Amino acid sequence: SQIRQNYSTEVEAAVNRLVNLYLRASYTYLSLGFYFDRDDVALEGVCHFFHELAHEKHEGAHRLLKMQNQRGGRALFQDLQKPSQDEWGTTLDAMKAAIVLEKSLNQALLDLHALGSAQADPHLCDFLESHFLDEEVKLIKKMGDHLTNIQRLVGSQAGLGEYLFERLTLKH
Amino acid sequence: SQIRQNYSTEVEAAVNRLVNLYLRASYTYLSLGFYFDRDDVALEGVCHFFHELAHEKHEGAHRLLKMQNQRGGRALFQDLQKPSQDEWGTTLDAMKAAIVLEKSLNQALLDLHALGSAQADPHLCDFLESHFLDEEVKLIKKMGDHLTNIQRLVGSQAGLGEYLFERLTLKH
Amino acid sequence: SQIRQNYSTEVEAAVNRLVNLYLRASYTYLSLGFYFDRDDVALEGVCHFFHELAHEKHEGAHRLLKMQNQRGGRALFQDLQKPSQDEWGTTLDAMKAAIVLEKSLNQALLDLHALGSAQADPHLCDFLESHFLDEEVKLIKKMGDHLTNIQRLVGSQAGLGEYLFERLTLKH
Amino acid sequence: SQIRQNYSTEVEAAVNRLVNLYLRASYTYLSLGFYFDRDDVALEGVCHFFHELAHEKHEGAHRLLKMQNQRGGRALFQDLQKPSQDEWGTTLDAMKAAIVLEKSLNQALLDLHALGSAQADPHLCDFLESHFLDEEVKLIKKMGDHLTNIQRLVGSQAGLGEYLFERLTLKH
Ligand SMILES: [Cl-]
Ligand SMILES: [Cl-]
Ligand SMILES: [Cl-]
Ligand SMILES: [Cl-]
């Protein structure tokens, strides 16, 4: 490569794996949103919430792939596994699955940051700091806030709570 | 002092104590608002309500200190005690603690007004009448209104009520 | 905590201590500004300079507390000590005290950055880099610039110099 | 009188005396301003400062006389003594004479407020609180601020200081 400088094969490979993780997360969110669009589920705000995240995770994959080319690494794509479930339960089940997914992405980001640090790759470290680490902290805080409000609304009137949360917290 | 006229040492000292009370109240409100911002509490309207009051109480301290200098008294600052609690319970617990705090500030204002009256200090009396006494009556009425609505919403579905009050009465 | 990830108890505790340091600094600046507002001091530009810093340090405390909740740590507030002096001397004395205060805040920021680095907490390190370290370097440079101009103006006409600096460098 | 209610002869007489005091103060300020307009004094900002106060004191007399008629009292005018000096010395001498004058007006206001209080005349007490007491406190604080800045500028270069104060603090 005519441009590659200070860009380890270890980082290059980890960036390709992280792209696979983001595209898998986008796919998971596509499935979550279409479940909430079912006529027998019908929670529009929940569908919109997950479809926005499907878009955000596609955009994160695109940013990683752009950076891979800016550094002179080579994008390599692998098969994308299907999401973990075909049906996603309640809004509470779905938001618990989303927080699990986001904490897995966050740990992958932190692992790649630590590899970059070990490789003395400050451009990689800055790139994750600037475009990924705070976006993930903010999203996980928002999901935790939502989980608390969903849990408070269960009581012994779960249907009522699930409707009110979708109507009065999520966007429709 | 070149400007001091009709300004007793008793009033000067009581104004400094009242400043300490207002800064303590601001601190209490800072803590109340950050509790409601926790991911395991997550009541944005409640956080906003208390943070606005933290600002209002800072502004009251600034107005007192400005008046102290306008009269030729000397601002003296003391240590600020931390708030009475680290965790504030439910919205109902927090609004009960806030009304207690506001009635303590109101009694301090009335005490200082009575001292000013005894000292034949009409500028001090006017100052409290114009900038503090009605603001306190209005705030205490608003808190009492909120307490009644929160209490009505407890029923036997406390979580539901707490969510609805934050969504439909407070600003988010 | 449902959101906490990669957030050490050491960092959590150091963030709470840093909040106390920022609120103490805000209080110091409140006292500095009210001293310059005295009818027997009467340097409006100096009062404005310190009151702006009191606001900036309150805002830094709020940003730290917001981040503490975003990471799933728990805000804990302690008593706030009163400022070190009741009267602040000349503009030169006050700007020397301010530079001492700012270098203490800067060292606390650098200490917390080093703890974050040792704890492999890149979100904390980025957070300080993005919102605190350069703001502190810029403020300390501005204070050093002011100190040089104040010192140049003392000569053997100190009152004249103190007036001219407040009129022609500070904002009124 | 068809309108007079709760308006003592004592207050009526004291309001007429206070009108005389305000018109005397206006006259004093007219003389102060014309002294500073002399070609051998030539401090335009000082002339403007005093002429604005001559206008303010005329307006206070007009407000008192309007209130006297609103209450059903009878305006009675007496001779107006000339000002205490024909020449007013330095800006410092003049601002010291002005503070003395303002403290005499302030004590007259406070005396009339106390008479109103003794006479259970709350409209009179409110009237002074609303239109006179804080205006006087604010003006005396401004004059004290000016006195400190003038004093700081004397040094051993009095002419220089007097010019700089008129140029950089007063309005021309
Ligand atoms: Cl699979
Ligand atoms: Cl305590
Ligand atoms: Cl202390
Ligand atoms: Cl005479």
Side-chain angles (χ1 to χ4, degrees), chain A residues 1-170 172, chain B residues 1-170 172, chain C residues 1-170 172, chain D residues 1-170 172:
Chain A
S1 174
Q2 280 181 342
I3 69 171
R4 193 177 183 143
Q5 188 172 208
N6 197 217
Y7 193 61
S8 65
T9 59
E10 290 83 359
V11 165
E12 174 183 20
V15 165
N16 286 148
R17 288 199 292 274
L18 189 59
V19 166
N20 195 91
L21 287 184
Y22 268 73
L23 296 173
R24 279 171 59 185
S26 185
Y27 199 16
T28 294
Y29 287 131
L30 178 70
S31 177
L32 272 158
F34 276 112
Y35 169 79
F36 288 98
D37 179 63
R38 287 172 48 171
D39 73 275
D40 63 351
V41 178
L43 292 167
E44 177 185 326
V46 185
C47 173
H48 288 165
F49 178 81
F50 293 127
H51 277 184
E52 168 60 21
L53 285 170
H55 172 73
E56 293 177 16
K57 295 309 181 193
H58 269 150
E59 291 301 312
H62 188 283
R63 188 184 299 271
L64 289 162
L65 288 162
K66 177 177 176 190
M67 180 275 287
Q68 177 86 104
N69 276 349
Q70 286 171 314
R71 295 295 304 274
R74 287 304 176 250
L76 283 182
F77 295 104
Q78 297 303 337
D79 294 332
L80 290 169
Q81 69 192 267
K82 73 181 194 181
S84 67
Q85 307 176 212
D86 297 324
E87 295 182 311
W88 299 98
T90 61
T91 303
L92 176 54
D93 293 321
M95 194 67 67
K96 282 177 169 159
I99 284 164
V100 166
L101 175 52
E102 289 305 322
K103 285 164 148 178
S104 81
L105 292 182
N106 197 212
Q107 194 53 243
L109 290 168
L110 292 172
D111 291 350
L112 179 54
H113 189 286
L115 175 58
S117 299
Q119 293 286 343
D121 192 340
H123 181 273
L124 181 286
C125 291
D126 173 77
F127 168 84
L128 295 175
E129 291 162 10
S130 296
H131 300 296
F132 289 85
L133 295 189
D134 190 48
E135 299 293 272
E136 202 56 37
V137 159
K138 285 178 310 169
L139 178 58
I140 295 167
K141 173 62 162 64
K142 176 176 290 186
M143 289 180 171
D145 292 349
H146 288 342
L147 281 170
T148 297
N149 281 99
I150 294 158
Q151 290 169 148
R152 166 194 283 140
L153 280 164
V154 177
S156 56
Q157 291 219 246
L160 172 62
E162 189 164 21
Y163 176 80
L164 289 170
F165 181 77
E166 181 270 337
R167 291 286 88 187
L168 300 181
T169 297
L170 302 176
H172 43 87
Chain B
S1 174
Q2 280 181 342
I3 69 171
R4 193 177 183 143
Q5 188 172 208
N6 197 217
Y7 193 61
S8 65
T9 59
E10 290 83 359
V11 165
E12 174 183 20
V15 165
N16 286 148
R17 288 199 292 274
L18 189 59
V19 166
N20 195 91
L21 287 184
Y22 268 73
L23 296 173
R24 279 171 59 185
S26 185
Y27 199 16
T28 294
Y29 287 131
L30 178 70
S31 177
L32 272 158
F34 276 112
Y35 169 79
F36 288 98
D37 179 63
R38 287 172 48 171
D39 73 275
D40 63 351
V41 178
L43 292 167
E44 177 185 326
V46 185
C47 173
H48 288 165
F49 178 81
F50 293 127
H51 277 184
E52 168 60 21
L53 285 170
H55 172 73
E56 293 177 16
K57 295 309 181 193
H58 269 150
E59 291 301 312
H62 188 283
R63 188 184 299 271
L64 289 162
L65 288 162
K66 177 177 176 190
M67 180 275 287
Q68 177 86 104
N69 276 349
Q70 286 171 314
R71 295 295 304 274
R74 287 304 176 250
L76 283 182
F77 295 104
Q78 297 303 337
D79 294 332
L80 290 169
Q81 69 192 267
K82 73 181 194 181
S84 67
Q85 307 176 212
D86 297 324
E87 295 182 311
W88 299 98
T90 61
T91 303
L92 176 54
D93 293 321
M95 194 67 67
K96 282 177 169 159
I99 284 164
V100 166
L101 175 52
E102 289 305 322
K103 285 164 148 178
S104 81
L105 292 182
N106 197 212
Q107 194 53 243
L109 290 168
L110 292 172
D111 291 350
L112 179 54
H113 189 286
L115 175 58
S117 299
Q119 293 286 343
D121 192 340
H123 181 273
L124 181 286
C125 291
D126 173 77
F127 168 84
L128 295 175
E129 291 162 10
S130 296
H131 300 296
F132 289 85
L133 295 189
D134 190 48
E135 299 293 272
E136 202 56 37
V137 159
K138 285 178 310 169
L139 178 58
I140 295 167
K141 173 62 162 64
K142 176 176 290 186
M143 289 180 171
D145 292 349
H146 288 342
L147 281 170
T148 297
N149 281 99
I150 294 158
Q151 290 169 148
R152 166 194 283 140
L153 280 164
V154 177
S156 56
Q157 291 219 246
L160 172 62
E162 189 164 21
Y163 176 80
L164 289 170
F165 181 77
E166 181 270 337
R167 291 286 88 187
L168 300 181
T169 297
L170 302 176
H172 43 87
Chain C
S1 174
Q2 280 181 342
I3 69 171
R4 193 177 183 143
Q5 188 172 208
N6 197 217
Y7 193 61
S8 65
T9 59
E10 290 83 359
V11 165
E12 174 183 20
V15 165
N16 286 148
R17 288 199 292 274
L18 189 59
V19 166
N20 195 91
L21 287 184
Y22 268 73
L23 296 173
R24 279 171 59 185
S26 185
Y27 199 16
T28 294
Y29 287 131
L30 178 70
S31 177
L32 272 158
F34 276 112
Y35 169 79
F36 288 98
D37 179 63
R38 287 172 48 171
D39 73 275
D40 63 351
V41 178
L43 292 167
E44 177 185 326
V46 185
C47 173
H48 288 165
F49 178 81
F50 293 127
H51 277 184
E52 168 60 21
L53 285 170
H55 172 73
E56 293 177 16
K57 295 309 181 193
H58 269 150
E59 291 301 312
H62 188 283
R63 188 184 299 271
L64 289 162
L65 288 162
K66 177 177 176 190
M67 180 275 287
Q68 177 86 104
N69 276 349
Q70 286 171 314
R71 295 295 304 274
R74 287 304 176 250
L76 283 182
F77 295 104
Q78 297 303 337
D79 294 332
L80 290 169
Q81 69 192 267
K82 73 181 194 181
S84 67
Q85 307 176 212
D86 297 324
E87 295 182 311
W88 299 98
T90 61
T91 303
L92 176 54
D93 293 321
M95 194 67 67
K96 282 177 169 159
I99 284 164
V100 166
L101 175 52
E102 289 305 322
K103 285 164 148 178
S104 81
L105 292 182
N106 197 212
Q107 194 53 243
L109 290 168
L110 292 172
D111 291 350
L112 179 54
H113 189 286
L115 175 58
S117 299
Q119 293 286 343
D121 192 340
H123 181 273
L124 181 286
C125 291
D126 173 77
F127 168 84
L128 295 175
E129 291 162 10
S130 296
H131 300 296
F132 289 85
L133 295 189
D134 190 48
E135 299 293 272
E136 202 56 37
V137 159
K138 285 178 310 169
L139 178 58
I140 295 167
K141 173 62 162 64
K142 176 176 290 186
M143 289 180 171
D145 292 349
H146 288 342
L147 281 170
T148 297
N149 281 99
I150 294 158
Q151 290 169 148
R152 166 194 283 140
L153 280 164
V154 177
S156 56
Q157 291 219 246
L160 172 62
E162 189 164 21
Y163 176 80
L164 289 170
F165 181 77
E166 181 270 337
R167 291 286 88 187
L168 300 181
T169 297
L170 302 176
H172 43 87
Chain D
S1 174
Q2 280 181 342
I3 69 171
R4 193 177 183 143
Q5 188 172 208
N6 197 217
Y7 193 61
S8 65
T9 59
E10 290 83 359
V11 165
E12 174 183 20
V15 165
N16 286 148
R17 288 199 292 274
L18 189 59
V19 166
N20 195 91
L21 287 184
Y22 268 73
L23 296 173
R24 279 171 59 185
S26 185
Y27 199 16
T28 294
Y29 287 131
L30 178 70
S31 177
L32 272 158
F34 276 112
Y35 169 79
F36 288 98
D37 179 63
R38 287 172 48 171
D39 73 275
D40 63 351
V41 178
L43 292 167
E44 177 185 326
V46 185
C47 173
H48 288 165
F49 178 81
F50 293 127
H51 277 184
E52 168 60 21
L53 285 170
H55 172 73
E56 293 177 16
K57 295 309 181 193
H58 269 150
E59 291 301 312
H62 188 283
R63 188 184 299 271
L64 289 162
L65 288 162
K66 177 177 176 190
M67 180 275 287
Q68 177 86 104
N69 276 349
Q70 286 171 314
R71 295 295 304 274
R74 287 304 176 250
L76 283 182
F77 295 104
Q78 297 303 337
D79 294 332
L80 290 169
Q81 69 192 267
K82 73 181 194 181
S84 67
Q85 307 176 212
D86 297 324
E87 295 182 311
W88 299 98
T90 61
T91 303
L92 176 54
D93 293 321
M95 194 67 67
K96 282 177 169 159
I99 284 164
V100 166
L101 175 52
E102 289 305 322
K103 285 164 148 178
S104 81
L105 292 182
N106 197 212
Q107 194 53 243
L109 290 168
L110 292 172
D111 291 350
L112 179 54
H113 189 286
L115 175 58
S117 299
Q119 293 286 343
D121 192 340
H123 181 273
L124 181 286
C125 291
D126 173 77
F127 168 84
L128 295 175
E129 291 162 10
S130 296
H131 300 296
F132 289 85
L133 295 189
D134 190 48
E135 299 293 272
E136 202 56 37
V137 159
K138 285 178 310 169
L139 178 58
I140 295 167
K141 173 62 162 64
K142 176 176 290 186
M143 289 180 171
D145 292 349
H146 288 342
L147 281 170
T148 297
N149 281 99
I150 294 158
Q151 290 169 148
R152 166 194 283 140
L153 280 164
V154 177
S156 56
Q157 291 219 246
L160 172 62
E162 189 164 21
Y163 176 80
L164 289 170
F165 181 77
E166 181 270 337
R167 291 286 88 187
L168 300 181
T169 297
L170 302 176
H172 43 87

